[PDB]
């Protein structure tokens, strides 16, 4: 395969260079250790409003003020 | 007599033949240069992207906290 890419690179390196971006574009992101973090940045994005519930009195995870530990938090992007 | 005669030493050889320099660095060089000069901008764009996303989340909850009274 080295003598029929040699004699592509030789004859049109342009179409060698944007089959080899193309390849690189297409595996790079299957590959890629940060996307899930793209996906979560994503993901954080305040666009509306977080409106919030009623309460029965059983819920252990939201929290009464933005101010408590309970709720998600945002560390990961801060650090990064 | 006096008349056009070259000197008696004759003149001097004159270049006839071509000369091209053959000059600038070797494709290697600047194919380094310019995947380096990629790597960098690639490298700075990341950086102040997130910062630009970082500011952008800043200013979407002061809009989210200042929602209500409007
Ligand atoms: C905007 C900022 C300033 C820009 C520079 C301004 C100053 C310099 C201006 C120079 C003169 C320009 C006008 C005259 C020329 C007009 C004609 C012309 O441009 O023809 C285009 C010429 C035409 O080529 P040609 O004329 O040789 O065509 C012959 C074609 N074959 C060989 C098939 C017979 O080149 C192209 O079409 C190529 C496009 C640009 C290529 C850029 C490559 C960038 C790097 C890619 C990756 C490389 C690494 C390897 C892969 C790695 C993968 C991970």
């Known amino acids: ?80 | 007599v006096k008349q056009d005669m070259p000197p008696v030493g004759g003149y001097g050889p004159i270049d006839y033949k071509r000369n091209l320099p053959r000059r600038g660095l070797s494709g290697y060089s600047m194919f380094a240069v310019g995947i380096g000069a990629l790597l960098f901008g690639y490298w700075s764009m990341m950086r102040w992207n997130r910062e630009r996303r970082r500011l952008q989340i800043e200013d979407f909850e002061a809009r989210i906290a200042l929602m209500p009274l409007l």
């Open chain 1, 1 to 80: 395969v080295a003598a029929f890419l040699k004699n592509v690179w030789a004859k049109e390196p342009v179409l060698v260079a944007s089959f080899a971006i193309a390849g690189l574009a297409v595996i790079l992101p299957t590959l890629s250790p940060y996307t899930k973090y793209s996906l979560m940045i994503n993901r954080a994005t305040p666009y509306n409003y977080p409106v919030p519930l009623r309460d029965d009195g059983n819920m252990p995870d939201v929290p009464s003020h933005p101010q408590d530990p309970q709720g998600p938090s945002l560390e990961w992007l801060k650090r990064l």
